[PDB]
Symmetry: D2
Subunit: 152 residues, 4 copies
């Protein structure tokens, strides 16, 4: 804006640990589809998002755990009339680490989830005005932490 030539966005989070490999999808114009995986005994083990980028899909990088045995879930949104209004979940200890154990996504049409274990410390982000336009965080054995880009 007055410093560098890189546009800035509001970012909220992280929820989870403060430790595992960092990832950052950056900011887009909306969300078409979310793919994740979970294990009902542990935590979240995958995140991949199909973003909107100015009217067309942009397939985000797959952020995958090192370990196997997760159950995949696909959330296909009726884009653009359907959009996420609230994200909630739980953080908790697994094998000595604080990780994201559960996620739920509430849209204007449906509630998707909870996926994973609803045990530990809850968190929730309701949005009165604005949109989630991006994800970042960290994943090793499980999803350690995550933050969200918010925009008008």
């Amino acid at each position: 804006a007055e410093q560098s030539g890189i546009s800035q966005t509001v970012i909220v989070g992280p929820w989870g640990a403060k430790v595992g490999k960092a990832f950052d999808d950056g900011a887009f114009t909306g969300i078409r589809e979310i793919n994740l995986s979970y294990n009902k005994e542990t935590a979240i083990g995958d995140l991949q998002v199909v973003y909107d980028l100015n009217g067309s899909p942009y397939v985000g990088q797959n952020h995958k755990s090192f370990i196997t045995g997760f159950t995949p879930v696909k959330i296909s949104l009726d884009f653009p009339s359907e959009y996420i209004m609230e994200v909630s979940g739980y953080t908790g200890n697994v094998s000595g680490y604080v990780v994201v154990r559960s996620l739920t996504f509430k849209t204007n049409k449906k509630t998707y989830g909870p996926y994973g274990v609803t045990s530990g410390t809850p968190f929730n982000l309701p949005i009165e005005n604005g949109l989630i336009v991006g994800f970042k965080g960290s994943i090793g054995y499980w999803l350690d932490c995550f933050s969200m880009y918010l925009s008008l």
Copy 2:
């Protein structure tokens, strides 16, 4: 479009049901005045905002009842700003209200003020600023939301 500017708003935390208030959006935050009762919840809320480099005293949002302990949080504006807001919501006398609040800045943690029981919530901010508050207060702070901006 309408002729009124808009900003990101997150929340509400607390009830999903008091007198509603909406301060709107400002340039920043200079001072927060709140009150709490270590047996019940948060009562009063009043914020001194920044408006383009001058203090702007927000309306006092007061509980209907007395018996609260007042707290003043005077921030070192503009170098000090809130990076995380956390608290607890829970039942008090049949109503779900905001029982506890804590404010973490880049300099210091303020609180918890009130009762730390019920369901926790937290809003950490990686990039951006809280620039306003809205919500509802009856006997206690029933709910609140926050305006966020760059």
Copy 3:
């Protein structure tokens, strides 16, 4: 955002000179009324704005020329259904200085102006999406330059 506790806004301009006393109203939530003055032989000699601040009026500081003999004009907008869509005007030389000689304001309802002398170099700012929420600039004998804060 990540540096200080002061919120930032897009600012466009200046139009006019690069020199006279600087003023900066800062950013608000909308515009209710604009007051200006002009002299048909010279340039713009006054600017004062009644802003909206979260649903109520905020009377901006009067930014007045040192000299006398201007014709006042008051633009009372039907706030909030009426808002400015385009600002245009002219910059030009008066008495050896580059100054703002003319202004016109086009809203979704009416065109107000031109006020002043339509002579010199034209400029125009049409807005497809967004709002003018603030003014800054410089005024001495005449309005030397001005910029505008823009917001969603």
Copy 4:
């Protein structure tokens, strides 16, 4: 609201009447490719954007006709960015088109490219960034608008 994010858009400059295009909004600008004819106006426009730290090659928006001179503006991203866009609009063969463009960065001025006659326009930016282009191109660039962001 809708599920699509929005940004400030200023413009259009040029005609108020070609094939319309809309690149949308990105993280920043790495490279601009344009073409001009020193007798008529601007023809082609194509932008390499930044998308979250990677180059993103925007669609080539080409004139229907040939005979243009190509120009490449390779910015030193992210330290170099555009601070002002100026140009001229005027009649060419019955159509009001964008005849000239110049780009001023914090490092250098690029242009003018094309014909500097007609009605001037300029957009200087004190705070913020150009993050996208839209408009219409027939024989020439008929009009264009710019996405602005922090």
